[PDB]
Structure formats: C-alpha cells, structure tokens
C-alpha cells in the first residue's frame, strides 16, 4: 500500500520527463568538443558548426563526467548538451595485450625452485596476506629483475605468475617504445603509465631494451638523444609514485650488468633474480615432463641422452623432442627410437658451437 | 638465433643444370616459336646464372 | 523504492532549466554550457584568452554596437574603426578580448599574463612531512629560508630593502629525498606546486617549443605566488654550446627562450623555481649565472647520527624489541645515502615474516648487509 501511494502521482511524471528529453534528443545530434572547463559556470567550446548557445546542463549528465578536451553532443542550431559521447577509441599506445588468468602453470618446470620462491614472496604474498604487511609496516618490493639468456624460464615464469596472481597482466614490448621521432617516444611512455593507472592493480611485464643500457656521464647527449630522454621519464614515473600493489613491475633483461644503478634505485627494486646455468640433475627433471607428453618407448635410455648433454637449457631440450617428433611423423609411426634422439641432439650441437675450449684448469 | 624462437630454418639450393632446363620450358609455353628445336642443348650453353 | 525518487529529481530540474534555455536562446549565447567546480557566489567577469572566440558580441559603442575581433582562418574580420570598444570583456565568446597578432583592436583584457589553454600538471597539497631527514637536514633548513619565509613575512624584507632569489637548484640522486624535499616544502608552504616535465615540452615541430615556455610564464605571473618544479631539466637544460649540428638547435632555442623571460623585464614576483639536475656540471654558465640562479642546495653523505633518525622514523611502523641498538651496526655498515638506509630496514621485515615471528630480532639485520653490498655493484 505505501508503494501504491507513491505510484499514483509518479506514473505520469515519469512519462512527462521522457517526453521532455525526446524534445532535446531530436535529430540530428552533432558531435563536437569541450575545449576547456571554466569553473565559474562557463566553458570554452570549439564548434565546427557555427552558432553556440550557453546552456544549463541536463540532470542525467553532469560536469563531473565532463573532462577537458571531451567529446560531447551538441544540437545543430540550439547547440546544447544532450549527453556526453560514449564512443571511445582503441588504446593507441605501444604493443599491448591484456590478459586475465593465462592457461600455464609453474609445475611444469622443475629443479629451478629457489628463484620461484623469490617472486612468490614479493608479488603473490601481499595479495594473499594483508595483515602480514601491516605488522612489518612496509611494502614488498615494487619491482624485480629477471636476468638470463633470453627466456628459457624467465618467459615461462611470467606466464605462469599472471594466473596465480589473479589480476590483469599487461605485457609491453620495450623496444617498441623507441621511435626516431621527437614527440612519439615520450608520448608513448606517458600513455603507458596512463593505461596502468586505470587497470590497477596490474602487472607490467617490461621486455628488455637497448635503451636502458646507456646513461653515459652526460644526462643527455648530442647522439641519440631520445633513448635517454625516454630513459629519464621511466625514472620520473617510478621515483614520483610508489605502488605496493597498484602496479607490480617485472623487469627483464638478458644481462643486468648492461643496466644502470639509477634504473634500479634501491627501495623500489630490492630483488635481483638470477637463473643458474644448466646443472646436470635438472636436465633430467625438465626432460621427464617433456617426454611424458610424447610417445615413449622401452628402448629409450633417458639418462644417456642427458649425460651426452652439457650446458643446454630447457628450450633446447623442449626443442630436441619436437624435432625428433617430426622425423617420426614422416615415418608415420608413433613409436620413438634411440636413433631419432641422436640426430636431433647432433643438429642442435652442430649449430651452437664453433669455439675452442677454456677448460682443464686441473 | 636463440633456439625455440626458431623452428626450421631451410636451405634454398643455388641453381643447377638440371633445374635450368625445365624453367625454360615453362616460359616457352607463353609464346610461339618453331617445333623442331633442341632446347636441351640451349640450357647447356648456359653457364651458371639465375632463374 | 529508490527509483521513484530519482525520477522526481530529473523532472524538477528539467522544468526550471527549460524556461531558462528558452530565454537564453533569444539574442543568442556564448560557448555552450556551465560547468561549476568553484562556488556560484564568486563569479568572474574576466576570463582567460590569447585569441578571441566570437559568437555574437553584443555591445555599446557609438561607431558600431556589435563589434567583433577575430583572427580565425575563415572570419578573421575586425572592427571597422580601430580600437573602438568591442568584446564586452568576455561576453559572447568567453575569451573574446584581443588577438595576439593585432589589427588595432580594442583590449579590455590582455593576450598575455593569462592561464589560457594548457597542458599542465598542477598538484594540490601533499601529505608528506619528514621522511629521510637526518642527512637531508641541511637541505630542509635552507629551503624554508628561501621559499617559505618571504611568503610568511614579506613586510620585514621590504623595510631592510632586501629582495630574495627567484630559483634554487637541487642535485644528487632522485628518490633519495632530493625529490621528497620539494613536495615536503610544497605541502608546508601552501602555494600551488606546478609540475612541468621539461622532456614533455619538447615537440615534433619548431616554434611550438618556445610557445610553451611563454605560456607557462603568463600563467605564472597571473597567480603571483607559485612554485614551478622542473623535472630533470637537462633535456632542454644545458650541455650545449656547440650551436647546432642538427636539431641540437631546436632544444637550444627553448633553453635560450627561458633565459629571455628570466633575465627580461618581468621581475620575480612571488614566483619560485625549483630546478632538478643530476650532476649540476652538465648545465651551462647562463643557467648558473646570478640574476636568476644564486643558491644551489646540496645533498650529502649522511653522518652516523643521521642514519639513526631515519631508522627511528621507520621503527614506529616496524614491530621491534628494543634491547639492541641499530647505531652500532650502522657504523660497521657501508656509508651510503638515505635511500639504502631505509631499504635495508625494509628488507629486514621480510625475514621475520618467513620466520613466523612478529617482532624484529638482532638476526634479521646481519642478513641485509650482504644483499645490499651486492646490489649497487649489480
């Protein structure tokens, strides 16, 4: 009954309002742009029509949804605001894909275990535990650096981590920020930061660059100016605003001794993560998972191929199997033999080396 | 060059005497000329040279 | 339940506005809407400009009564008798006044010393106050005297007949509290902190760069009492004397343009400039020279006692057991600036968290030094 009472005057009032908007809404409706916001009940507008008319805003749309430089709808002869335009373009920034929860996990690699705890404690752990950060009173590191011969576990570990962590992953290719155009490169780094802030919490994966390698002793040079001009703005963004979790940074570089200590800045980055070289046991572990996928046979001697191997990371190993698997496929058999493994192990050995040895230190 | 950012990298052979004979044949099917010519001789006349 | 109420809210506002638009529609009207983000009991009647947008321009003058001032590509039309009252201040255009170009057209409001259009970061008051003081201690003492004191007690300086500097310079590594210090005074001093990134000002096409420098200064003048924070000016700060060799000229033009405004006819006003360099050496003698740059405020290797104050700041958040003393360790530890001193502490809390303890320990501290000593050397 209380409802009925509100309802009796309301229904008509409800219709009347809809009639009133329709009068404004009436075709056509021209897009135009709000130049700037003059807070003493004014604003600057640029019209590509002709007439402009200073109006009071409707109550559906407010000025709190108006931003400077925004697109809005104007009528073509009473030039008034029906609504703000709701059609926005593509992020124009440098190469990015955003992905929520990727397929892969970190249970597939093995024997690498220690490194895996390091990223764990930094990134994953505060999300899991508020109050452990409160006791200590501090943030886990803003960002980490993963360093090794290009992604054989660096790349693997990142993919895995995004699923775990359950926030948006954005992967940016850093070389692509470099442009030989005066405006372009700086605009991009500032758009990259802009994009982060909206999507927060978010993970930033920075793929290695050439441009983080050079600082010299000048702060800018008559050489390629842009690479350092850009390098600086990376720093300004970082040392201007610290995140505990709003942005998490994964940085990647082939060698970290290329980097600059300016770039690190202690108290943002405290963690430097190093992939050990191939260690003999590890090779067998990594392998056992790769063979499982594939056909296997009772004439395979798993150790013998691993033993024959020395200083080869998981990628070549993943590769050997794939190569061999192709040979088999040509034979139109799904049975694997020793022979297959031998030719593939030889091809990859042939290609990496032509050097001479520095051993025999005994 | 870092492996697994690679799959197959395939050689393309530098041309040869057998090869040259049959490209010449393909080309000839575009234009009209005499019948009773020995083309076999003609490829041989050629040293090495591109397709 | 909520819905009934929301519908009633649209409708009541609509009826009053429809009457007002019908009325405003007659005789036409300025740029096209009202946005409020101040108060309605303070309303300006001077509005910013550098070009004159006109839409009607109704006025009172004898030589004609609806005079116009444009410069626009199509309709650059102007007064029919020079310098006769036209805009009605900022009536029917909201920035109608005068054109920078000139056609001997009336000026009720200037094309310079205005905020106009911008791309700016203005950053309302911070929250930080003391967070690395101890060796940042000297830098604080001087910065207050230069920036704060003239604004607090100007009347005193006049009696003496002394005028305070216009700019101070910051150097050493950023994010060590060199950076913090500028925000920490900005919050205390209560004057707008305006952040311009010099590197951004750099543009793809010439003359634009100068234009920007100029715009900044016009806004700066209007507001009197403001701080211009220049982030790592060296991009368009000095290095350079070589006089071009291929677009080392374009960046040099900006550097020279700034000098003109500083050394020029303007005067200081209540405007303060904070400059940020890596090593000050880079910068050119013109940038260094008195009659713009006078005080250079420095950073330093922090004394032992100092380190302790920083640690003291940190120890309020961090659960501790005080029966051990960090200063003894600190003498043994590498001498390093403020940022490493906070970082070792921060590292210390983690070890606890793994240990499954809630209070600090003597044990944690030993560990931190080995990593940190490694981290500078990469």
From Swiss-Prot, chain A:
Position of the Glycyl lysine isopeptide (Lys-Gly) (interchain with G-Cter in ubiquitin) cross-link: 159
Subcellular location: Cytoplasm; Nucleus; Membrane
Topology term for the membrane: Lipid-anchor
Modified residues (N6-acetyllysine): 180
PTM annotation (Phosphothreonine): residues: 356
UniProt region (Disordered), positions on chain: 6-26
Residue spans of biased composition, Basic and acidic residues class: 8-25
Keywords from the named record: Acetylation, ATP-binding, Cytoplasm, Deafness, Intellectual disability, Isopeptide bond, Lipoprotein, Membrane, Myristate, Nucleotide-binding, Nucleus, Phosphoprotein, Proteasome, Ubl conjugation
Chief site of localization: cytoplasm
GO biological process terms on file: proteasome-mediated ubiquitin-dependent protein catabolic process
GO CC annotations on file: cytosol; membrane; nucleoplasm; nucleus; proteasome accessory complex; proteasome complex; proteasome regulatory particle, base subcomplex
Effect of residue 250 to T: In BKAH; uncertain significance; contrary to the wild type, it fails to rescue eye defects in Rpt2-null Drosophila
A GO term, aspect molecular function: RNA binding
UniProt record similarity statement: Belongs to the AAA ATPase family.
Assembly and binders: Component of the 19S proteasome regulatory particle complex. The 26S proteasome consists of a 20S core particle (CP) and two 19S regulatory subunits (RP). The regulatory particle is made of a lid composed of 9 subunits, a base containing 6 ATPases including PSMC1 and few additional components. Interacts with SCA7. Interacts with NGLY1. Interacts with PAAF1.
Name recorded for this polypeptide: 26S proteasome regulatory subunit 4
Segment of the intact protein contained: 79 to 440 of 440
From Swiss-Prot, chain B:
Role noted for this protein: Component of the 26S proteasome, a multiprotein complex involved in the ATP-dependent degradation of ubiquitinated proteins. This complex plays a key role in the maintenance of protein homeostasis by removing misfolded or damaged proteins, which could impair cellular functions, and by removing proteins whose functions are no longer required. Therefore, the proteasome participates in numerous cellular processes, including cell cycle progression, apoptosis, or DNA damage repair.
Protein name: 26S proteasome regulatory subunit 8
Annotated compartments: Cytoplasm; Nucleus
Encoding gene per record: PSMC5
Organism: Homo sapiens (Human)
Similarity remark: Belongs to the AAA ATPase family.
Subunit structure: Component of the 19S proteasome regulatory particle complex. The 26S proteasome consists of a 20S core particle (CP) and two 19S regulatory subunits (RP). The regulatory particle is made of a lid composed of 9 subunits, a base containing 6 ATPases including PSMC5 and few additional components. Component of a complex with USP49 and RUVBL1. Interacts with PRPF19. Interacts with TRIM5. Interacts with NDC80. Interacts with PAAF1. Interacts, in vitro, with the thyroid hormone receptor (in a thyroid hormone T3-dependent manner) and with retinoid X receptor (RXR). Interacts with ERCC6.
From Swiss-Prot, chain C:
Keywords on record: Acetylation, ATP-binding, Cytoplasm, Nucleotide-binding, Phosphoprotein, Proteasome, Ubl conjugation
GO cellular-component term (any): secretory granule lumen
Subcellular location(s) per record: Cytoplasm
Residues noted as binding ATP in the record, renumbered to the chain: 172-179
Source species: Homo sapiens
PROSITE patterns: AAA (PS00674)
InterPro entries membership: 26S_Proteasome_ATPase, AAA+_ATPase, AAA_lid_3, ATPase_AAA_core, ATPase_AAA_CS, NA-bd_OB-fold, P-loop_NTPase, PRS7-like_OB
UniProt induction comment: Expression is not cell cycle-dependent and occurs throughout the cell cycle.
One Gene Ontology term of the molecular function aspect: ATP hydrolysis activity
Functional summary from the UniProt entry: Component of the 26S proteasome, a multiprotein complex involved in the ATP-dependent degradation of ubiquitinated proteins. This complex plays a key role in the maintenance of protein homeostasis by removing misfolded or damaged proteins, which could impair cellular functions, and by removing proteins whose functions are no longer required. Therefore, the proteasome participates in numerous cellular processes, including cell cycle progression, apoptosis, or DNA damage repair.
Post-translational modification N6-acetyllysine, affected residues: 72, 378
Full protein name: 26S proteasome regulatory subunit 7
Family statement: Belongs to the AAA ATPase family.
